[PDB]
Amino acid sequence: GLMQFTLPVRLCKEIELFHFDIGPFENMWPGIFVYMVHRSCGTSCFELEKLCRFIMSVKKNYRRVPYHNWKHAVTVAHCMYAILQNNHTLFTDLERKGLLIACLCHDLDHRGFSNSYLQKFDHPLAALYSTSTMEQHHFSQTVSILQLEGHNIFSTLSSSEYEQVLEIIRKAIIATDLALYFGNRKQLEEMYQTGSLNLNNQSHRDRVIGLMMTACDLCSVTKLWPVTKLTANDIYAEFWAEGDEMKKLGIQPIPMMDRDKKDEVPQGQLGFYNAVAIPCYTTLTQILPPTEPLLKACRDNLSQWEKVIRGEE
Numbered sequence: 001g002l003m004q005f006t007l008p009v010r011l012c013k014e015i016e017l018f019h020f021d022i023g024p025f026e027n028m029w030p031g032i033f034v035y036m037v038h039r040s041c042g043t044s045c046f047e048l049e050k051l052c053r054f055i056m057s058v059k060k061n062y063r064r065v066p067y068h069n070w071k072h073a074v075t076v077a078h079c080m081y082a083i084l085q086n087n088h089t090l091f092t093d094l095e096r097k098g099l100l101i102a103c104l105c106h107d108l109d110h111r112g113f114s115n116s117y118l119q120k121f122d123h124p125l126a127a128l129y130s131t132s133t134m135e136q137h138h139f140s141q142t143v144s145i146l147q148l149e150g151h152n153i154f155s156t157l158s159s160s161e162y163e164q165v166l167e168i169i170r171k172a173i174i175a176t177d178l179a180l181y182f183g184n185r186k187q188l189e190e191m192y193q194t195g196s197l198n199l200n201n202q203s204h205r206d207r208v209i210g211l212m213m214t215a216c217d218l219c220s221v222t223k224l225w226p227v228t229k230l231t232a233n234d235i236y237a238e239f240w241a242e243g244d245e246m247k248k249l250g251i252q253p254i255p256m257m258d259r260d261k262k263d264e265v266p267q268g269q270l271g272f273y274n275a276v277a278i279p280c281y282t283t284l285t286q287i288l289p290p291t292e293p294l295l296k297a298c299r300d301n302l303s304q305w306e307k308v309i310r311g312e313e
């Protein structure tokens with residue numbers, strides 16, 4: 001109970017910043033997550049023994065894929081931590097509890113393949129979940145792990161608080177389906193510009209948490225350039241293997257997943273920053289001004305991709 005987690009000085013200071021990289025030491029990532037819960041939520045939020053057992057079962061249910069792996073989970077949780085710590089008073093006790101968990105769990109048992117590839121392969125998950133296929137699976141894996149003996153980190157919540165937190169987690173995880181992001185951000189933009197945006201309205205909160213989830217999920221584009229660039233290699237390592245698997249089914253993949261179009265990666269990154277990332281962080285900064293460092297870093301990384309195209313690197 002009197003047992004804080006503490007980090008070395010460099011990590012203790014830099015973990016507070018949006019651009020923090022959790023580092024290559026896999027065995028330090030659980031401590032980093034517990035540290036973040038203890039500070040964003042409190043030392044009393046979860047029973048340490050149950051939290052530790054839950055974190056280790058979540059880790060075991062991420063696969064050894066290039067991008068959608070345990071490092072991505074903890075990375076997306078850290079970005080959410082930074083958002084929560086810069087907007088202290090905007091969020092409920094249950095939201096602080098649920099959102100770090102949602103982030104850690106949001107790609108549970110990812111196989112390295114898009115919802116599109118499961119549907120073309122006719123994977124059993126695509127018959128059980130016709131839209132947001134992997135994201136319904138990730139939420140289902142989360143509930144499974146919460147129900148293992150000694151793993152119910154929410155056991156001290158009332159039955160109605162328990163239903164509320166699992167509903168915050170379900171919506172947060174579904175919102176990481178990027179097909180849902182475009183319309184979500186469009187509605188949030190209209191609501192903020194016409195001044196109808198209202199954070200006492202639950203359906204509006206749900207949208208704002210949805211956007212926070214997209215922002216955390218995309219946060220490789222907000223890191224120092226060497227982090228951004230090397231993460232991009234992992235993203236394509238997945239996409240190109242899926243492209244290979246599309247060609248095995250007799251289907252030309254989209255350019256994004258075709259390794260024959262390696263040479264076009266810099267231009268593909270531009271499209272992605274202009275169509276997805278910059279608009280995401282723009283709308284987020286309008287709604288939650290202290291998240292502006294995410295927009296600023298994204299714009300710096302867009303400018304680095306522009307430099308690659310100009311042969312200046």
Ligand SMILES: Cc1ncc(C)n2nc(CCc3nc(N4CCCC4)nn3C)nc12
Nearest residue numbers: 218221235255256261264265268269271272
């Ligand atoms: C950084 C990042 N974070 C998250 C996600 C989901 N993504 N997805 C991307 C891929 C962007 C992209 N690349 C291409 N190509 C066309 C031919 C060459 C490459 N098209 N597009 C849209 N980057 C990311």
Ligand SMILES: [Mg+2]
Nearest residue numbers: 106107176177
């Ligand atoms: Mg996902």
Ligand SMILES: [Zn+2]
Nearest residue numbers: 106107176217
């Ligand atoms: Zn993700």
